[PDB]
Amino acid sequence: PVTETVDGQGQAWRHHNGFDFAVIKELKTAASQYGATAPYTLAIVESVADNWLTPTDWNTLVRAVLSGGDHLLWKSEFFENCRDTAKRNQQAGNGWDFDMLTGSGNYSSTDAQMQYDPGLFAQIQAAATKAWRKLPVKGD
Secondary structure, X not given: OEEEEEOOOXXXXXXXXXXXXXXXXXXXXXXXXXOOXXXXXXXXXXXXXXXXOOHHHHHHHHHHHXXXXXXXXXXXXXXXXXXXXXXXXXXXXXXXOOOOOOOOOOOOHHHHHHHOOHHHHHHHHHHHHHHOOOOOOOOO
16 A cells, blocks of 8 residues: 655655555455455455555555456456556557556556556556456355
């Protein structure tokens, strides 16, 4: 998770924070129990994304909290919707989405995304949970 902090001189900055285990733990719980499709777990998926999050803690979150189905629906749709959105947004030539809303293909990395943009944060958040929901069945 990322928290942004402002200094008394009016500057905005932010720091990375460690992966909240309680969060991972219980999303893992709902994942095993509820399945990623039951309102509870995806409510958590989107609520966690409602916080400042980066591709780094993103990939760590998905890969831990779920097992098996995560990559296919959550993530493969992530990659699709990210570049889908990128196609639409870069028609306009925003300078977002293609590299940023993905993770970072070439340049933005954790850094530029973590500095955010109002339309970038909105787009990345929406795209994330969008992806990070679609699991049909869980269990092995």
